[PDB]
Amino acid sequence: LRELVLLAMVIAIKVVLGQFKVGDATLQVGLGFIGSVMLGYLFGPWWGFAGGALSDLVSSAIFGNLGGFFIGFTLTAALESMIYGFFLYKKPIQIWRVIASVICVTVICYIGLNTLWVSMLGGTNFMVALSSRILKEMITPWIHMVVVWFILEGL
Numbered sequence: 001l002r003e004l005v006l007l008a009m010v011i012a013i014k015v016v017l018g019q020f021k022v023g024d025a026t027l028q029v030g031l032g033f034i035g036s037v038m039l040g041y042l043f044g045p046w047w048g049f050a051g052g053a054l055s056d057l058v059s060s061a062i063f064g065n066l067g068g069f070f071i072g073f074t075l076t077a078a079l080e081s082m083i084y085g086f087f088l089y090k091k092p093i094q095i096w097r098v099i100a101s102v103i104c105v106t107v108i109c110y111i112g113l114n115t116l117w118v119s120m121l122g123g124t125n126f127m128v129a130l131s132s133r134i135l136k137e138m139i140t141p142w143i144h145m146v147v148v149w150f151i152l153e154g155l
């Protein structure tokens with residue numbers, strides 16, 4: 001199939017942009033979301049969950065993660081690309097979908113899950129973790145939404 005040539009390239013994209021990030025073994029800030037949104041826009045949730053799940057393995061395998069591989073961050077990258085799917089897939093680019101999608105991702109994946117992982121990886125209690133990370137998760141969503149627009153428009 002043609003679209004599977006595509007899937008690879010966008011995994012490749014997702015992996016590459018993912019390497020533009022600043023941060024800690026606790027919160028990181030980067031362009032990885034850009035790729036993961038593409039996966040949900042173009043391929044839908046299932047293939048988007050697959051591609052996200054996948055692109056994390058690859059990115060891990062090549063670049064490696066601070067503090068080592070954790071199978072949790074994998075799940076996150078899969079849900080991340082799958083939620084942008086349920087929202088944005090085969091639909092007219094709208095602002096309310098962009099807000100809803102980035103808001104759900106940020107709550108479940110970033111605020112919920114990645115904190116759960118970080119809390120686990122470090123010795124912390126969850127809210128200790130949450131307190132270190134919550135400023136980012138309040139600020140970035142608007143940047144994510146704007147970027148998500150230009151991405152969705154551009155393609």
Ligand SMILES: Nc1nc(=O)c2nc(CNc3ccc(C(=O)N[C@@H](CCC(=O)O)C(=O)O)cc3)cnc2[nH]1
Pocket residue numbers: 024025026027028029030031032033056060065066067068069070071072073074109110111114115118136137140
């Ligand atoms: N398999 C695997 N994949 C990974 O990416 C990974 N990353 C780490 C490094 N730990 C972290 C901790 C927090 C964030 C983080 O806070 N990311 C943002 C999303 C990225 C963004 O929004 O720019 C977040 O808010 O959770 C990333 C990596 C450790 N093990 C891993 N293991």
